[PDB]
Amino acid sequence: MTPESVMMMGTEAMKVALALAAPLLLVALITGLIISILQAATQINEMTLSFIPKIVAVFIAIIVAGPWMLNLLLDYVRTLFSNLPYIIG
Amino acid sequence: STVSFAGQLHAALDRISDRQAAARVQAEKFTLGEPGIALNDVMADMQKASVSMQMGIQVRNKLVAAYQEVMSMQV
Amino acid sequence: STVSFAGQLHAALDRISDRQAAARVQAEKFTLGEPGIALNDVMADMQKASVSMQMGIQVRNKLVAAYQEVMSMQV
Amino acid sequence: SWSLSVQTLVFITSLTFLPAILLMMTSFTRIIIVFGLLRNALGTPSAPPNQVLLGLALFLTFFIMSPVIDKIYVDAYQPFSEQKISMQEALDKGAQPLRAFMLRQTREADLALFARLANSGPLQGPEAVPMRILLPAYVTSELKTAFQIGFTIFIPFLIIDLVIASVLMALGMMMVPPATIALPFKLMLFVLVDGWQLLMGSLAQSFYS
Amino acid sequence: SWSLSVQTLVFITSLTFLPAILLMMTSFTRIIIVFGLLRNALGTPSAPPNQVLLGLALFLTFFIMSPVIDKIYVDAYQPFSEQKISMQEALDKGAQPLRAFMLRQTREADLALFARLANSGPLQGPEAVPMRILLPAYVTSELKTAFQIGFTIFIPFLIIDLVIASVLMALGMMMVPPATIALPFKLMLFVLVDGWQLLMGSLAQSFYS
Amino acid sequence: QFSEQVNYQRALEGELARTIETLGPVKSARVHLAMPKPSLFVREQKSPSASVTVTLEPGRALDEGQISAVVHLVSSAVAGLPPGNVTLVDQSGHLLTQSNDAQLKFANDVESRIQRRIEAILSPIVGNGNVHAQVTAQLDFANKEQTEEHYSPNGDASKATLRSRQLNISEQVPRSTQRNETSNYEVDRTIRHTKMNVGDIERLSVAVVVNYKLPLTADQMKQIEDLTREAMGFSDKRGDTLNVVNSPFS
Amino acid sequence: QFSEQVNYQRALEGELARTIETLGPVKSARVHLAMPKPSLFVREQKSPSASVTVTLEPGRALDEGQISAVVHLVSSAVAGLPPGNVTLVDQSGHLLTQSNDAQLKFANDVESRIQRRIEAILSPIVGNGNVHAQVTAQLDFANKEQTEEHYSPNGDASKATLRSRQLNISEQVPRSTQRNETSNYEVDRTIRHTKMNVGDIERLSVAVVVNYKLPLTADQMKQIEDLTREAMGFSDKRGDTLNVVNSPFS
């Protein structure tokens, strides 16, 4: 092992994690920002008024993004375990 | 060919068993009054069968000890 | 020079084996009728071989007990 | 040669030294360490230690060693049947395939450590190394290999835990125990990938390449 | 045949190998792993591992094995009782029904992997796979099946956890610890659904289908 | 990420293409490599492969010399590719590789050497073009291996070498006499391990014709025959054969 | 963690190009390496290889001296690269590196050297161009190994060496006599271990023609014959063969 290879594996893992999470974080931030924009202009609020919009957004994202997300994670993990023998040296 | 540990133990146990069967047949024929078989032959073969069985006992005991030491390992 | 405890163990077992071989060949040579060899020497050599083999057995038992007692402790 | 005394005296003691030296000189160290680290991932035990992981490991290492044991059989057991061989040349005849296997698995610098600290003389080739220097070298290199495999095993479940926690944090979930939600997804990633076959097979492949 | 030596020698060794290999060779692996995972849900252990779930798993596996053990009995214990069978044909006569049972649960591909890492030649039929191939394949397939059942069990309690958390956030529970709130609701869900009955029944019906 | 190794291959093949482009009788040269696979459960890892297509300069064909040049270039370029695998294909078929007849070529070289030497000696005698010789030669291509173990005889006591000797003698005086002689020797021993050369000449057949000056005289002829016997390296123990004649040329 | 290795390798290739082009009769040199992946846990590794293609100054070729120059430079440049693997290519094929047939060339230049020496000796006598010689030299290419274990014979007790010696003597006086005697010796020993040379001469065959002035005198002939015999290193035990004849050229 060399630190170059462990950083390579780490960045690959970080990019699969980011791709895995991208729709969820994206829609959460988008709906939160929309309800925060509309928070003023009738500045009335209790704490957030955005929780339910965020939940329905992540529902929609998990349904529509969905299969490609799980397929990407599975392909990553299957390739990782397949080439596991060849990375020892 | 291949090893097949189970086959090796099977063959060893068959060897022990048929050695004892030969010793038992020798004793049968001697006590039944047949020509040939001598008392020295009977005693020597019976002692050989006893020694072979004792060796089997020791090998078994060591295998069992090794097995119960291997599978008391904490993973 | 270096000890290599395996080397000392091999030497001891070889000593026991060669002593027993000497005794067995002398029994061969006595019961076969060769002149010279006397019954007192045959019996004495057999007894010496038995004592050496018993010493080997006792040393084995102590070494095995030591090993299994060292290997029974937790790191 | 030896005479049904010390023969059958070296045999019984060899069987005594079996469970530790022989199961930790061949395989079953890398495999069991990978299995234990895998079990640390995915949460709880989820496989009885003394029974299923250990037994499966014993089977698996028998399966890796079957070629080396085949060569050891051909070069020791068959000739040791009464003829031209009795536990003197038989020793190194049965060692040589195993020594070749271990050398082929050892780190090329753990040998250096355990040789230089033994005051051993300069070595001509791989065949000149003794069993003495070979054992600890193989053990240390095998521990390194096991920990590398374990790190790679911990990668994807780390990914799942981080993504789950981040989603909960973005949704505002201040105080939810993300491990509880993430555990079924850990098993998820471990079964859709068909993780047991892949892991068993990848261990076997890594072990000889 | 054998002569009351190796008979009553292999009997006692068979007894010693019983608890580990036989139990992790027949059943009680799937059952116990599924019980462990159900214990992971519902909050804390809250059911003693070392006594009650083990006993219930033993009883479940006895009940499931009763057809297998009855076939083994009629095919060995009567015909091994003194006539035409003495612990050589007893072994294979008893193995065949158990072999068929284990084959009926093995994943179609675990057998493939373990055969391919034995360098075994081509196989003609299911009767051609030996116990050497058949143990670890069955074990790995059993672990996969156990984890699948684990998903199906975690699903509803995950739903309860998330719905309680969402209600608490929308209501404005800043950082109430929703786990303590959800634990009694998990128990409530598992008691009204009559979960112990229907869980052990589901495992049983799954296990031979 | 799978793309990067493939793009490495696509880079390497182009890089080799560009090397081959710069050698003269080439207009284009495109190369395909083959890393086999990580074979499963056997540590065998069969050798890689390389297939090269070249458009030669129009009307120019490549000798086997530059064929070996390009093949050894490619083999020495690829990581661990034995040159046997490197296959070359010209602009129109004509597999320059043969992936057994090197024997024929080598034999022709030996014969040509002998023939040219014979002509070099005999040309000053009878003229530039008054002599023709042809050589057909037998070669051994079998791999010999030999191990002789000469011992020296020590039946003679005066050249015997005794490590040990027990000697007993007894006699009574009707005489009872004893003589026992246990003797251990140390024996001279010689061990050659010869691995004979492949391609050795084992039989020459040389035919020579000379022109007329009118046939050359008998002594003038036997001196020619002796000279050609000399130039062959003619050895009788090898079975070499030599025929020389004189006749009008054409 | 991989493409960096490619960058490093191709940068090294550029560096070696920059070196090689500063070698005189070179304008450009495109180079390829072949580095096997260094495993630290498997033992049986593979050596690397290098393939250099050079574009020479037009009308300039490299002798074996400069071939050795480039091959050594490249070999020692790359970590652990034996000069065998360095395959060089002239800008038109023409492998300057031969890395089964070189023995023919080896014999050829051996004969060339001996023949040159014969001509150099016999030219001052009969003229610069009144003599021709050709050499046909049989060469040995078998790997000869040997091990001799000469002992000295200690049969004669005057010059033996005894380590131990027991001697029992008895005689009664009807005479009974006994004489037992045991001896352990020390033996002189010589152990040679010769690994004979590959490529020695096993025979020579040399034919020489000398031009006329009219034939040269018989004594003048025998002195020329003795001179060329000297120049062959003529050994009768080798069975060297030599012929010298005189007759006018063409």
From Swiss-Prot, chains F, G:
Induction: Inhibited in nutrient-poor medium. It comes from the Bacteria. It is found in: Cell inner membrane; Bacterial flagellum basal body. Residues 174-185 have a biased composition (Polar residues). Disulfide bonds: none annotated. Belongs to the FliF family. The basal body constitutes a major portion of the flagellar organelle and consists of four rings (L,P,S, and M) mounted on a central rod. The M ring is integral to the inner membrane of the cell and may be connected to the flagellar rod via the S ring. The S (supramembrane ring) lies just distal to the M ring. The L and P rings lie in the outer membrane and the periplasmic space, respectively. The M ring may be actively involved in energy transduction. This is Flagellar M-ring protein. The gene is fliF.
